[PDB]
Paper text:
Methionine aminopeptidase (MetAP) removes the N-terminal methionine residue from nascent proteins in all types of cells. MetAP is therefore a potential target for developing novel broad spectrum antibacterial drugs. E. coli MetAP is a typical bacterial MetAP, containing only a catalytic domain. A surface-exposed loop containing Y62, H63, G64 and Y65 (the YHGY loop) is an integral part of the active site pocket.
We report here five new X-ray crystal structures of the Mn(II)-form of E. coli MetAP, each complexed with a different inhibitor. All eight structures, including the five new ones, have the typical "pita-bread" fold found in other MetAP structures, and each of them contains two Mn(II) ions at the dinuclear metal site. A single molecule of inhibitor sits in the shallow active site pocket. Common features of the Mn(II)-form selective inhibitors 4–8 bound to E. coli MetAP in the five new structures are that all use their carboxylate group to coordinate with the two Mn(II) ions at the dinuclear metal site and all take a non-coplanar or twisted conformation for the two aromatic rings, consistent with our previously reported structures of E. coli MetAP complexed with 1–3. The twisted conformation found in all of the Mn(II)-form-selective inhibitors 1–8 is in agreement with the requirement of a hydrophobic ortho-substitution, such as chlorine, on the phenyl ring for inhibitory activity. The twist angles observed in the MetAP complexes of 1–8 range from the smallest 23.3° for 6 to the largest 52.9° for 4, suggesting that in general, the phenylfuran-based inhibitors dock into the active site in a conformation that may correspond to a minimum-energy solution conformation. The residues forming the dinuclear metal site (H171, D108, E204, E235 and D97), as well as the nearby residues S110, T202, F177, H178 and H79, show little change in position upon binding of any of these inhibitors. In contrast, residues Y62, H63, G64, and Y65 in the YHGY loop, as well as residue W221, moved significantly. The same is true for other inhibitors, and the loop show a great adaptability. This flexibility allows the binding pocket to adapt to different shapes of the bound inhibitors.
Residue numbers in the entry: 2 to 264
Write the structure that this text describes.
């Protein structure tokens, strides 16, 4: 069921979480107009293997052929790095990373805007990160995941955007995806009360248009049914006695690593 990580295991999660976050901080300077997504993946894998001495949890997972997922514009998730796909000005791109180190997983992703940004692109990404942040500020013992899911949905929909229902956040530890499921919308099936020690991810997928998605015939690429833009941000966190601790925080994040709700 819902596992409570021991202090030792939480420390291992901090290490793994930091590594995942550092892959994103490392790749930043390379996300430029003209670069291929295949190249970005090789850079990430070489870094993960040769420098972090860790391993990508995506490589081989259900047969996935690459180390990280790179999704551009209308692609919602699981975009496959390809040497023929070049980034260009105005593109919004999500790079999703999951590394395993000392037996524990670190899971995180962020949006990158390539070259000259488009206003709609920046807005979609900003609102998506904001939906993740508001959810993070709600995490603390006693709160129900349903409340967080409902809050994310209300915020996103008020902005004229939609939340993807097919995918969700998840518990994480020695396993990539563990209990509980963390839906980013209201559901009567959700009734999970948070406890200190729980580690899970929050990773809303937000579409500028309709919520419906579609899977391409390559068996991996998921796109919006209406071809509207889609954005996602993800962080791995641990519930503490008075709130939570973000384990995959980056220099560019603008929310505190440790959130407290006590007086
Ligand atoms: C290889 O990527 C996947 C394939 C099947 C099911 C889930 C995934 C996946 C990619 C990223 C994540 C996640 O962040 O949870 O999960
Ligand atoms: Mn991920
Ligand atoms: Mn995840
Ligand atoms: Na996208």
């Amino acid at each position: 069921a819902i596992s409570i990580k021991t202090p030792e295991d939480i420390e291992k999660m901090r290490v793994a979480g930091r590594l995942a976050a550092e892959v994103l901080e490392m790749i930043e300077p390379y996300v430029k107009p003209g670069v291929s997504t295949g190249e970005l993946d090789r850079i990430c894998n070489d870094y993960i293997v040769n420098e972090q001495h860790a391993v990508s949890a995506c490589l081989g997972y259900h047969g996935y052929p690459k180390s990280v997922c790179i999704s551009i514009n209308e692609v919602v998730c699981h975009g496959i790095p390809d040497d023929a796909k070049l980034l260009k000005d105005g593109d919004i791109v999500n790079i999703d990373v999951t590394v395993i180190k000392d037996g524990f997983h670190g899971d995180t992703s962020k949006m990158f805007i390539v070259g000259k940004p488009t206003i709609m692109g920046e807005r979609l990404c900003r609102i998506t990160q904001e939906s993740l942040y508001l959810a993070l500020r709600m995490v603390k013992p006693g709160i129900n995941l349903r409340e967080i899911g409902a809050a994310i949905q209300k915020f996103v929909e008020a902005e004229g955007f939609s939340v993807v229902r097919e995918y969700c956040g998840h518990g994480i530890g020695r396993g990539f995806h563990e209990e509980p499921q963390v839906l980013h919308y209201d559901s009567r099936e959700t009734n999970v009360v948070l406890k200190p020690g729980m580690t899970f991810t929050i990773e809303p997928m937000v579409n500028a248009g309709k919520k419906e998605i579609r899977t391409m015939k390559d068996g991996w690429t998921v796109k919006t049914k209406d071809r509207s833009l889609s954005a996602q941000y993800e962080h791995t966190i641990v519930v503490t006695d008075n709130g939570c601790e973000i384990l995959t925080l980056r220099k560019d994040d603008t929310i505190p690593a440790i959130i407290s709700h006590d007086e």
